[PDB]
Amino acid sequence: GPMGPTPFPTAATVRDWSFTLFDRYEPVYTPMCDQCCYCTFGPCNLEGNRRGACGLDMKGQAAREFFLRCITGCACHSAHGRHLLDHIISIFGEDMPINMGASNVIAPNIQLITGRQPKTLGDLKPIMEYVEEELGQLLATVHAGQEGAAIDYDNKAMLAGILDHVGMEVSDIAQVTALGFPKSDPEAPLVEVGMGTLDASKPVIIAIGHNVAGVTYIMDYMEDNNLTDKMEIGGLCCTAFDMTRYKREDRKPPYAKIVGTISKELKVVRSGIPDVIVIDEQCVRADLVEEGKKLKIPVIASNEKVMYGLPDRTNDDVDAIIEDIKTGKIPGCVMLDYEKLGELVPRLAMEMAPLREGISAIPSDEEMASLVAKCVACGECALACPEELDIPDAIQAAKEGDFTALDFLHDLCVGCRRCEQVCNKEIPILSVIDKAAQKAIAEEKGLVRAGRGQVSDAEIRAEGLNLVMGTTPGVIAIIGCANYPAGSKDVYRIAEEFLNRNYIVAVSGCSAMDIGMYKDADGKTLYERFPGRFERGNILNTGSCVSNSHISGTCHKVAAIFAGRNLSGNLAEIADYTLNRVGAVGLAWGAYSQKAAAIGTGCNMYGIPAVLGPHSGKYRRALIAKTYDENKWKVYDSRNGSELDIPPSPEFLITTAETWQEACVLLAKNCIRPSDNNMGRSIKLTHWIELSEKYLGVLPEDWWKFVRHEADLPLSRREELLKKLETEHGWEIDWKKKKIISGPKIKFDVSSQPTNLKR
Amino acid sequence: GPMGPTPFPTAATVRDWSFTLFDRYEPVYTPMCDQCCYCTFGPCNLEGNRRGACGLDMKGQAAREFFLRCITGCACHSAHGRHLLDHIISIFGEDMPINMGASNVIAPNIQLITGRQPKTLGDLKPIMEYVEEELGQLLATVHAGQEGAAIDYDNKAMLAGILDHVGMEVSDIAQVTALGFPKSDPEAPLVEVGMGTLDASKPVIIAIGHNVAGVTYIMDYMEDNNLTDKMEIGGLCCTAFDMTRYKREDRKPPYAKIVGTISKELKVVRSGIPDVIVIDEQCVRADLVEEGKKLKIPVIASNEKVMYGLPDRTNDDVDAIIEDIKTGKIPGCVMLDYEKLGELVPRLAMEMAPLREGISAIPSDEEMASLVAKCVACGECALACPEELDIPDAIQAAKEGDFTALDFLHDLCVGCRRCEQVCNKEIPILSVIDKAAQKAIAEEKGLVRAGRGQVSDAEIRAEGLNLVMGTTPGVIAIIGCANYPAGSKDVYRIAEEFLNRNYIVAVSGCSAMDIGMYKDADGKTLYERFPGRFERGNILNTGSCVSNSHISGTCHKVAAIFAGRNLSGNLAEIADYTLNRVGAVGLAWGAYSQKAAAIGTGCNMYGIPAVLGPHSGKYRRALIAKTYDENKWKVYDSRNGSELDIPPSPEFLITTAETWQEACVLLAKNCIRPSDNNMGRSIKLTHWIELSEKYLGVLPEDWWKFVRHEADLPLSRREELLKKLETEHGWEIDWKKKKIISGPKIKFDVSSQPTNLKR
Amino acid sequence: TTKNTKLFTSYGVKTSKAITTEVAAKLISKAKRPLFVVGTGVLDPELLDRAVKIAKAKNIPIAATGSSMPGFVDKDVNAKYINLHQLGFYLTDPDWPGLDGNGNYDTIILLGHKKYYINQVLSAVKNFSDVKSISIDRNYIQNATMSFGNLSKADHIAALDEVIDLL
Amino acid sequence: TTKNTKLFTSYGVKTSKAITTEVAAKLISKAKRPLFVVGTGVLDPELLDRAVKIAKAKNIPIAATGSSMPGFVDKDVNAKYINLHQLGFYLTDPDWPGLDGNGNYDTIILLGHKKYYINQVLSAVKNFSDVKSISIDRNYIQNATMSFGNLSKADHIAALDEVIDLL
Ligand code: SF4
Ligand code: SF4
Ligand code: SF4
Ligand code: SF4
Ligand code: SF4
Ligand code: SF4
Ligand code: SF4
């Protein structure tokens, strides 16, 4: 077919596009240190942008650190994909047609990057070999004296991001086409998520991690022996989504449950509910064994990436391991045999449920009396709290009797146990907060729609006109982790506000879990208040982190199916199209992990801006555009190659917001795109203006830079905005016919083709 | 053939060995920092071995940092190997048989790890795919909250080390079998190494980096156009070794020269000698363009890993690039086309030699007048000096008139330019030192024997009996970088001392360059004072860092050829044999790079202890054995699996020495092995005792723990040591026949087989 | 207001100089082109009162970072909205017109900011720019030119009262 | 001897307490099982003189790390050779009999050590062990319990003379 300039791209093939992006969106480096602790020549003081012993300056070191984070995230996703694909090929078979629904392009990222069009599962192995080889080449650059410019480190970070998206696509395709995941179903079943959805009177298996291959055998054993009714299995992190989507092509509600995000791991463990804990990989707290030994909770590892120092009993019989765990000889085991693990974990749950009875780390009513009337509010825990909660004030107010302060703190706390280790009184503050919010914990329930996987091309063809023309106000992609600044309600509030205005909201990862945990006055979550299709005012859950590739997939399929441009090895042109026409913005409010950084960078390279939380300023790189330099905002009209001016939107590719209201205003503004129809620009300007006036109290000061015609003004406020333009900015307005005759810097073009590439 | 338990091993297959090793050699973590800045949950304070927000403690963080360094080094070596092998296959062909001399095991590391026996250049591609896939799996573990135990991070570091010794083997095999490198020649030509070996009256091309594929085209152009006589080409770092080994199967001396190690890069650039600088891939200072612009020195990059931000003009014609560089339009370029680069660099050297005339950054006298007599010895540069040289004192003494202090400091300085940025007077101290030692620079000449590559099986079969029995006192492998604490003479002194005692000294990397730069009273270097075969009192140079795999290959071939044990996928047994019988110790006096850490760890996993410089305590891990715990020193006799006691040797697997005399004593002691012949042990004890008495003034206090018989004692001092044993330790001695009858803890066994594996 | 300068995690070896109230007042009244950078934490009834008075004292223009603009709508101050990460990026460009069009600002006064946010934003200003930073918040900001020490709410309010008394 | 505590690169927030001469003498004379850890830098004839006198004062056993044993051969002191990394690893094991066989040492006195070496060796002692460290060297050792400030050679010699005068 018609190929492209950059198939199987490397750091040198994508350099032109990366530098074109960085020319408008300058990188901003916020170093976390003024020292480089890398080789034995150092550490070198780089404060004041000085140079180390190798000559690297502060910007180079910050860029290297961010690039290392990006490649670490890409390596996580690629290793997950490789292991999952190998297991699927070994069990199911290599020659299995790929089944992702009724799509003309099952792999919109694989085709865009590697130029290939996979048909079976054996055609995903060369792609994974390309993502591992290039990952090795990129990790070779973190060495001392192996590069020196920050700009090329940024280019390699962009390449790592796109490779991460390719790896996520590979993993999601492999698991969806095999494990019977929903195939683009817009009405996937609603499932119950929450700590209070687990019945403590039954054996409980808590599956923490990200890989679903290991736990499929556990569920097969449970179904084959008729144990689903007499046992409970609950997932944490994205493995919960993967288990929930398992075998759900029949749309029947599942029996496995979702317990929460990473912030709930320590709370779940300390509550004593789990009877067995099985860990898989990726986001897994590195202190589970220490707490489980105190609470008599066995821990089974099932991976080579995570083994926790536990004894390896893979070749041992199941019964001997059960006896060894029951007698307390060992605090856990590492079972890499999937059949043996699937047999062992449920039997271990049965044999350990009666042994541990009401065992919990929560003080009941008496130890807390001293634990609260022992502290003197010395302020060390607040200094050690990542969120800087007023823990001494809350405890002091609890001393008088009012315990609602810690009840409030429970939502604002992430369960990290950093307050209990700086105290000089040895107060388990987290358990105190847990009991102070025990009522909420018992009433912590919600509904989340199961991951739909990939968006079919029918909905994409129906919605591409609205997206490109601007009729639909845009696609807000709420992704990322659960390291929120002010609790898990900011994402819910943003999603509700942007669904009330007919945006297309697409969620994935822990953000979907946090969104589905809150209810309105009628007790209905957002997932039952709004549908799950790909159109205006519809929230659709795409799945786990490995399914964050599907959002960029829809972004590329808008240019492929609708615009008609070819996808094979055409990263630059498709990214330019997405950056110039498609209105899509990502939001990672609680991103902490390197995987989130890799996903955000890959979305940047594809032309999708992203707004992160205040905690994500520790990634040491943002991409921000100078809105006062008129020389940056010039594109080439593809019809004749002449210079065409564009509005300053998006004014960034990665930025961090302080509060969720500022995030709402940013998301509303940065969905505006060049080549916006009159109706589309009118809708987007209307929504941005109302959001800014509601959440900041003032009209945006840059609103007059986005008006190219009276038609572009909001219909309800056309007169007042016309008066504002007439008086404040001296624009000449033909008032007889409500016409704008002088003042706009860019005349409205009926059909223009703005692009950044001269070719 | 007869396979082994662990072919294509992973983190779980090598876990048993790794844990067997760590049971005797406990890890010692020296955390370089009290914080972890990995995810946005942090930074987390881990002082006092506290736990972060993910539960990781200080030991876990230090182990993760060291493991990240190890995988970075492994990735460097593996990427070098993959790129070199791809280029060789593309140009020469996939069907070439591997030519590594007369060896029945051309790949002693590939066969040991992957179980394969390559016979063609196309049989090295699956191996490199295994090293990239496992590298991706290992880099996936650096993610936040992935692993949770320091011991498993150590196990993964050991796996990363071995997969490095595999990647280095692949790269060396690929380049030796193709580029006509010497094939195990014990009479490789002596080449001139030194800054003063370059004639400033001719055009000079300085090749900095590690990859030789790019510069082979430059040399082909120079030879084809008859330019070797009228031009000079000099290499820095290991690319110099690769060039001087190019096409040297004919033993004719080369025309390319060696300028020095990494410590000489800035000095060479500032001296103004280079006319064109071409940077390949590794160990390249990241400020070359900044100095070259001031000294009008063009810079050409030739890799994707190193681009320096320079314009990419790969598709442009050579003449246009030459004109653009000559006019000063650009300060360099990136040329990934090898033929065009090979044509451009010599022509650029010709056209730029007459333009730059005596341009240098070395003030002679009058400009140095103020430069020296403006400082007031405020002590900031000494605070910023990595070696903590008395720079204020040297400058103050230079003010009076005596300039010999800075002349001395020149050898003790590494050219890192960290003293010129903390100064509040703006003194180019490095240039001051350079001129103060200008006379030495003019007299900086030496001879180094070209890399011989791999050790042939004939010499190994001749020397294995002496090595295993102890007749040869041991193999000292002086490897590593040039970050020395007290100048480049420590390695020379150690090599001379250990060659005077008939050890087998094998050098590689920058250490060979530093050893060959010093001469005795007759003006003969060590390479002409001693031969280059594999036997007692012979220094042999193996080549570049990629040739450090051949030392471990020799250690494995001792067990393969001599002991007769099979090699295919038999890492544990061969490593146990090397640790228990073969006397070999590595020395990395100036290791700074992550590659050195990976090489040291891989040598640890193979059972080869290593002594590092004082600067290598910043690697955050050592492997040290408790010499007072009698329970650690127990092995199993392979005849009947009974417990057999062994002497506390080696007392470490990785340690750091303070001075070179302590390093000599450590190397002498830790060459002692279990199952040492009464002669082998007499020789080793004699040498260790003499070295300890010479360099510390005292008899070793642990010498009586290594005596098992009268003949184990040194022959010359048998009587006095017998008296010392009789009086000090109460041993009962039959003085009629100088016999021992009571006192030794371990009886001498005529034929014992000590091993650590019960199986 | 300098007694407590304790920290949990350090950015390096160069820290902020803990200043008294008189020193802060002298610096505020000594600057030429000052800028009052106020975060969302200023919307606390106890702090929004002072911030407005401090701005009214020397007619300092106000950058109301985040969702803190609502507190400066009806007041008699010159307040404008700007993203902190875009403000920090713009302060390192000498050729930036500013919030009005007269250039950059030689010093920036910080009030009511989250510690982990302002520290990271100031890491890009104290290193790549030449702008002085005066942190009058109750926390100890390490990546600032001059900062207040750790203070309680009552002590922070008293220090702000002392500062405005000296303006 | 505490005026200059300047550092180039830090390890964290917890640093060493710059102690005076009298404090150092009191701590040396107050310890129960002390250990004099002397590096190769003690071979300077200005320092080997004092080190021997300090050892003779309170009969402190000496760990002559590195190639510093030759300076303690003929002297009337109890000196033994040990590797610094090995010594630091052994000091974190409470069951270590010691250089003589009577257990560990509660405090270690450091003299004549290279900064980058002793700092990294002490990073494994101040974190994983319960051993006090008194650094009487002319440099400022950050990873020590109590250390001297940055001093010149003459000032370091004078401080050592004062230390011996108070012992
Ligand atoms: S990599 Fe460069 S900046 Fe970092 S420690 Fe080494 S010499 Fe210093
Ligand atoms: S650290 Fe402990 S004593 Fe201090 S305020 Fe917090 S809970 Fe109270
Ligand atoms: S566990 Fe919660 S309250 Fe304690 S430090 Fe962590 S986030 Fe703060
Ligand atoms: S980058 Fe991390 S490990 Fe290195 S000095 Fe800074 S906080 Fe410490
Ligand atoms: S990885 Fe763990 S220790 Fe490191 S910053 Fe994140 S939470 Fe803290
Ligand atoms: S930093 Fe400069 S002024 Fe200070 S002692 Fe060194 S050379 Fe002299
Ligand atoms: S350039 Fe030499 S003298 Fe200057 S700081 Fe580096 S090592 Fe020390």
Author numbering:
A (entry chain B), B (entry chain A): 40 to 798
C (entry chain D), D (entry chain C): 4 to 170
Sentences from the paper on this structure:
Using a traditional blot-plunging method, α2ε2 CODH subcomplexes were observed. Sufficient CODH subcomplex was present on the grid to generate a high-resolution reconstruction, however, in 2D and 3D classifications of CODH particles, there were no classes containing additional density consistent with ACS. Here, we observe a similar phenomenon, wherein the full 2.2 MDa ACDS complex is dissociated to a lesser extent on the chameleon than on a blot-plunger; in both the blot-plunged specimen and the chameleon-plunged specimen, CODH particles were observed, but CODH/ACS subcomplexes were only observed in the chameleon-plunged specimen, suggesting that the ACDS complex underwent more dissociation under blot-plunging conditions. The MetCODH α2ε2 heterotetramer shares the same topology as MebCODH and harbors the same set of metallocofactors, including E- and F-clusters, which are not present in monofunctional and acetogenic CODHs. In both cases, helix αA shifts toward helix αB to close the gas channel and block CO release. Additionally, helix αA residue Arg500(Met)/Arg142(Moor) has repositioned so that it no longer hydrogen bonds to the A-cluster coordinating Gly279(Met)/Gly596(Moor). This type of protein motion in CODH is quite interesting, as conformational motion is not precedented in CODHs.
Carbon monoxide dehydrogenase (CODH) and acetyl-CoA synthase (ACS) play major roles in the global carbon cycle through the consumption of CO and CO2 gases, production of acetate, and breakdown of acetate for methane generation. By contrast, methanogenic archaea employ four copies of CODH (α2ε2 heterotetramers) and eight copies of ACS (β monomers) that interact stably with eight copies of CFeSP (γδ heterodimers) to form a massive 2.2 MDa complex called the acetyl-CoA decarbonylase/synthase (ACDS) complex. ACDS plays a central role in that process, wherein the A-cluster of ACS cleaves acetyl-CoA into CO and a methyl moiety, the C-cluster of CODH oxidizes CO to CO2, and the corrinoid of CFeSP receives the methyl moiety, which is reduced to methane in downstream methanogenic metabolism. Through plunge freezing of the ACDS complex, we captured multiple subcomplexes including a CODH tetramer, a CODH/ACS pentamer, and a CODH/ACS hexamer and characterized these subcomplexes via cryogenic electron microscopy (cryo-EM).
